[PDB]
């Protein structure tokens, strides 16, 4: 600071590094904070039972896209940030949890609101299910739904199982290609989680109450 030089240039060079980094973060903001967020909102909003591939492609593409951001999927060799690298992975795992949880919250909302079938609308694969009509007569002189009501619940469970296997075999951010990048164990975990196994009891209980 005595000849009044080189300090403005050092300050300007650090400013240059900081503006380049502020840039790179503005990248990451743009590139992560909204496309995969809106994809997550869509994944949450997808009604699995009935609604009158896409987001899977989308998530694979978001992976390759984030990979374009120079992210250290392997640790930097000269820096050796082995601990460092796994924290973005824990965050991306929390986000993958938010994705599977979007699907899971949908699944659970539907498992709860099965009872009003006429109110929601169905998609093509699920044409037989909505507001199910059953024939009633004197089966062996006894008034019954001619299709066994138990059978109709097994048809509801067959729709549920088609949906559940479609949702268990996915290609999400971790499952990139046939679960190659990461396993699909969270989906069988969800299948044995309360929203499925414990709500089967509530389903069958309301069903037996209808029978009652």
If DSSP codes are grouped into helix, strand and coil, which group holds residue 137? strand
Resolution in A: 38.0
Supply 169's token pair.
Answer: 């075999």
Helices 35-45 and 82-112: crossing angle in degrees, nearest 10, is: 30
Listed in order, strand segments (DSSP E) in 31-188 are 136-139, 142-145
Q: Which residues contact 62 (CB under 8 A, 6 or more apart)?
A: 35, 36, 39, 173
- Which conformational region is residue 131 in: left (phi greater than 0), alpha (psi within -120 to 50 degrees), or beta? left
């Amino acid at each position: 600071t005595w000849t009044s030089m080189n300090i403005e240039s050092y300050l300007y060079y650090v400013h240059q590094g900081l503006k380049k980094l502020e840039q790179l973060i503005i990248n990451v903001n743009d590139i992560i904070e909204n496309r995969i967020e809106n994809n997550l909102k869509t994944v949450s909003k997808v009604v699995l039972v009935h609604l009158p591939n896409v987001e899977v492609e989308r998530a694979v593409d978001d992976l390759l896209q984030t990979i374009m951001l120079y992210p250290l999927d392997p640790h930097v060799d000269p820096v050796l940030p082995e601990e460092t690298k796994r924290i973005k992975r824990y965050y991306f795992w929390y986000f993958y949890q938010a994705l599977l949880n979007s699907t899971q919250n949908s699944l659970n909302a539907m498992k709860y609101r099965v009872c009003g079938k006429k109110i929601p609308g169905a998609n093509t694969l699920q044409n037989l299910k909505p507001f199910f009509q059953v024939e009633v007569q004197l089966n062996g002189d006894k008034v019954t739904l001619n299709p066994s009501l138990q059978e109709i619940q097994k048809s509801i469970n067959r729709a549920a199982t088609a949906v559940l296997r479609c949702s268990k075999h996915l290609y999400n951010w971790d499952q990139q290609n046939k679960d190659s990048t990461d396993k699909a164990t969270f989906y069988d975990m969800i299948a044995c989680d309360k929203e499925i196994v414990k709500v089967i009891l509530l389903l069958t209980g309301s069903i037996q109450g209808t029978k009652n």
